[PDB]
């Protein structure tokens, strides 16, 4: 037995999965699921549906140029069976899978390079327009910190930063409404 691939979406088609359409020109189409089968019967292009390997390869979001992808092929010339050849093939498959995973992760990071600059610039713009929403201490808290600083001979601004740290640690949410007292 072997593992096919879905014609529409490219997922691994295991035995007894999906359905095959036999066209009268000589084409057999294997679908992994009724989702792909019904999209094919509706004549939707796999290259336009973003959940498919066809779209991902067309958009360049799959690593397609690599040396590790030249090891799997449909072998139309059979090789005489050799135990050592099959064993070293198994070891090769394991190591090639590891190398392919590592290079794929590198490829994805080069896809996602410029993000941190984009969120930094957006964050600076948002803070610049909303300086007034940044956390601040209450007026009564400022009064009590001022009188405590006057009493203790300490730095009022230091007390302000410590109290801001305390409210930064203690996060509290507010509730809508309130109970109406009965007569």
């Amino acid at each position: 037995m072997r593992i096919e691939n879905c014609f529409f979406c490219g997922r691994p088609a295991w035995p007894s999965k999906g359905i095959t359409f036999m066209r009268n020109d000589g084409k057999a189409f294997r679908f992994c699921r009724s989702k792909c089968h019904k999209n094919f019967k509706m004549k939707r292009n796999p290259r336009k549906l973003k959940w498919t390997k066809a779209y991902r390869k067309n958009a360049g979001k799959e690593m397609v140029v690599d040396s590790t992808l030249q090891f799997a092929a449909r072998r139309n010339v059979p090789v005489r069976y050799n135990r050592e050849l099959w064993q070293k093939t198994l070891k090769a498959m394991e190591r090639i899978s590891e190398i392919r995973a590592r290079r794929e992760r590198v490829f994805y990071k080069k896809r996602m390079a410029g993000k941190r600059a984009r969120e930094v610039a957006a964050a600076r713009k948002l803070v610049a327009e909303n300086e007034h929403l940044l956390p601040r201490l209450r007026g009564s808290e400022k009064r009590r910190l001022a009188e405590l600083a006057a009493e203790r001979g300490v730095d009022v601004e230091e007390l302000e930063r410590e109290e801001l740290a305390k409210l930064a640690s203690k996060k509290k949410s507010k509730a809508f409404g309130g109970e109406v007292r009965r007569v």
Binding site: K172, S173, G178
Partner: protein, 110 residues
């Protein structure tokens, strides 16, 4: 070890409690499930819901109840004379950014 007067904020997953419910009955059933949830959480048969909580449940009509809701339940003493139960719970809607990802928390008394 837990005092009679105590307030906690919970997340109620109303989606699994309203799954398959008739459309003209989903929001009143949501109110009844909130009352049953508060009774199970606090042990109080007397549960009073905030009108803002009722509005929040009814925000999208009779069949548009949110999947999750953040509430505060406050077990308080019933000081009225001739009361059947000495305690009751009051349930309010809580203003949060997102009701997902939140654990059950105890509201500080101050």
């Amino acid at each position: 070890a837990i005092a009679d007067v105590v307030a906690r904020e919970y997340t109620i997953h109303l989606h699994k409690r309203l799954h398959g419910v008739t459309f003209k009955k989903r929001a009143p059933r949501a109110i009844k499930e909130i009352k049953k949830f508060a009774q199970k959480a606090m042990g109080t048969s007397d549960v009073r819901l905030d009108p803002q909580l009722n509005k929040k449940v009814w925000e999208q009509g009779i069949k548009g109840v949110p999947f999750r809701i953040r509430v505060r339940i406050s077990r308080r003493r019933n000081d009225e004379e001739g009361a059947k139960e000495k305690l009751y719970s009051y349930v309010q809607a809580v203003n949060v950014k997102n009701p997902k990802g939140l654990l059950t928390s105890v509201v500080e008394e101050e």
